[model samples]
Target: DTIPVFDGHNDFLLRLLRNPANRETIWLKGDGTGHLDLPRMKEGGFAGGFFAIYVPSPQAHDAAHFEAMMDAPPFELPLPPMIRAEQAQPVALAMAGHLLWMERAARGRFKVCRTAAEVRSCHADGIVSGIMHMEGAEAIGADLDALHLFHSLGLRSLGPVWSRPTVFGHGVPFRFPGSPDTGEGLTEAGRRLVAECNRLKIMLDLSHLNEKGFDDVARLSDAPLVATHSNAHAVTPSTRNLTDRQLAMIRESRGMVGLNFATSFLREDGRRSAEMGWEPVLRHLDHLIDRLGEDHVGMGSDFDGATIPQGIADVTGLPALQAAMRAHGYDEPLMRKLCHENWYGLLERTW
Candidate 1:
């Protein structure tokens, strides 16, 4: 298999946590019902990967319309719960419960790794290292000391906001063919969070942040910029994809962008079509490589975290992507960079 990818993000833990019946030991190797599992990962040659702890909003039921509104002109929309500072502790504890369960269950099969050294070691040993990451800043309190506590508990990467407003910053709604300038950017607290993350060597994920927040990180952080999982805005025009300007910024900073394998983010019409294939994905890869250079890109398949592409329906189809890249003229050296070496290089330098 290709040098086993080191993905920037995945959400299998949330699924297993929400349903205890889907414990890792038993559920990881089943019929591959989900986007990712131990069996699928191993078969697909996946190495270490980021396991994001994302808390879904209760308002998601009513917020479904917000997606359609994305293509509309910018207008104010009532935000969801900010996830109070006081609630951080309890929510983090609950998230921790899931991580603990996975660690204890996987034991020898997987590891909840905290540092770049650990991930490298796991890769060398043929074990899948799991990097603990938070998809939103809600679990962080007003004081932000919770960040330190979580870091101590092995949290090494975080996004300042999800698809809602938080004390730290604003996030784009699930709107397609829309610019990320939908709302204001990072708050003072959010700026502090970026600085603190730089100081602590924590990777700041820009996947869900608004355009302003993206700029804030560029201004505040000295570390390499990275969007854990995202697509090219030029192709999909979704709020979740990065604009050409943003991609250029990442290139200047020697940062990395993982191409998210979400059909909604890959298709030109921005519709979640089952007919989606590797062509659009190749388009994204070509765009990123053309703009950011191959050394600064990699895979950030948002598996178990969002809608998947038709060609890359699950983890096992990763090689199909590699083959497609080869057919698209990506040489072995470039393919190696796109697969895992680029991620490894970024972690080694940034951490």
Candidate 2:
């Protein structure tokens, strides 16, 4: 009954990095806020996770500029000055700073793992191993030397784009009850990037990519397709959710989709309602299981980044979801796979 959850995504690093002083105390123990902290994760039986290093645009904090840009569609809106290719050195240095902070702060309590082998090793040692993941490709340039650089520095997974356009491809907006057919597929650079990622054994994440970009990966990469965190469009009809066609592609590719815990993505109305219940979450899980089969479905709770169900407030409340699954007829074996084994299986097969 102790289902160990290997979470798919979280922004805890950014949260901690934003407040350096809080890193010493807030990370290891729960601050009674945020979806994850070391203490809460252990209490909830979280085994390990993908710790995302997402680079926000410089203008992200500029409320006036962001509000002005909000009038236009997400893709059409101009991206603020990003951490540039020339600035990759400094940017990556800053990223490394956060990683070092995580290591020093966690001490012997946690580890940052790079390969599938290391993940299993950490698990065996009972340490909460985290894979270093890049949520947006902005930090790496079109040349992709930075990709190799980061790979050497422990980067094992990446999403080509976030919820906005990158040089690689477009991403769907946060529109509710909508589909992901919003823009063009991968550019020439993106194609090259996928090929390189396939060569490097880096797990490509399709979570924020638009429909066309998803197809491009299907055609190009030999690796098992994966969306680190996503919901079913059939259940919620959100642009952020995957459609039946996308699900079929994942199934055919022997890939996996990590079920997101965000309430907006789970609800039929697709509103960011905090009144989290089990019905919508169960519906999406059931639909994904039916479409993709048991082995290809797993948990990818988008903690620390989005609003989730109140019933499953933070990492400590993960037991509620496990209990719900058991009540809905999932046996221990299936629950184990859903909780963490499936992720290890896929990572082993792909990496």
Candidate 3:
């Protein structure tokens, strides 16, 4: 059997923050509330991937309403309020802390990976390697002292914005029938941030940035232009998905775009509910391959972040996805690349 995979992105740190009491238990014992857990990952052949550090908006008390809006077509919803680095630091740090705690608590079952080589070794040894990823720079002050600090603390990847405006760049809203070309590009601060990331070898995630912002990064960064969890805009038309031109840019840069499994971004109707078939997922993979080529495409399931299809509901259900792909006519080499090899190839040049 082919082993599991190195995933692209997830929100398990935020999940840990939500249920502090049983955080370790939830990971080890599988609490049934969230999408990812160590047990489920092991069952699913989960190698390990980027675990996102996202600070939730205080104004997200109406998440149900927000999800409802996400389900409907062409709805304009309010964006979450911007959070200053100072205000966001505590939560961000706590998330990072949780990752370290998990490592210490794992007794070798888990390892916080710092390099591409470390990731491969961890997988070979059956240890789950978690690479630290920041979904937004709300925790990073403009001064960039925090950026240096975070690298030292093992944050190897970062996204400047997360569906909201930031000091560095703008983000695409959650509206359907909208383009990722939503706003102005990076500011002076954003350019500086990209330069700093490049110098430090930290990977930049274009998952939530607007089109111009993506353009700016393509111009500025020396690293591969990776969108950790985004889809084909032509397929779903969600503001978060990438357009063909954007894919071309990434492909030209020898970058990568992991296929997002969030149902809202998968379904043409933009529904969060997962009453859909798996064919759309195949369509996305096929489309992405056509645009990005096999080496630059892989799975970026937004586990613990958005509502995913019930067919591949959580970490354990990944095998079904693999089977579905095989039935869809994907060969073994293609399956291996999509499952994990592509990520290593991208990161080799990047990190």
Q: Per model, state how many residue pairs clash.
A: 1, 0, 1
- TM-score per candidate, in order? 0.92, 0.92, 0.98
lDDT of 2 by residue, 164-201 (tens): 77778888766654578888999998999999999999
Q: Which candidate number would show the highest lDDT if scored against the true structure?
A: 3
Pairs of residues clashing in candidate 1: 177-237
Decreasing lDDT order of the candidates: 3, 2, 1
Q: Where in model 1 is the C-alpha error above 4 Å?
A: 24-27, 60-79
What lDDT tens digits, residue by residue, belong to model 3 across residues 211-256?
A: 9999999999988899999999999898999999999999999999
Off by over 4 Å in 3: none
lDDT of 2: 0.82
Ranking by TM-score: 3, 1, 2
Q: How much RMSD separates candidate 2 from the native structure?
A: 3.1
Give the alpha carbon lDDT tens digit for every residue of 1-351 in model 1.
465889988887666656766574544565446787777789898897888887766655124565444334342345576777566556567667777676677767788887778888988999988888888888887578889999998888998988788889998876755798878989889888988898999999999898988998988889889998998998778888999999999999999999888767777877655477778889988998899987999999988876677777788888887888888898899988888889989887788
Model 3 weakest 10-residue run by lDDT: 58-67
The lDDT of each candidate is 0.81, 0.82, 0.89
User: Which model is ahead, 2 or 3, in terms of TM-score?
Assistant: 3
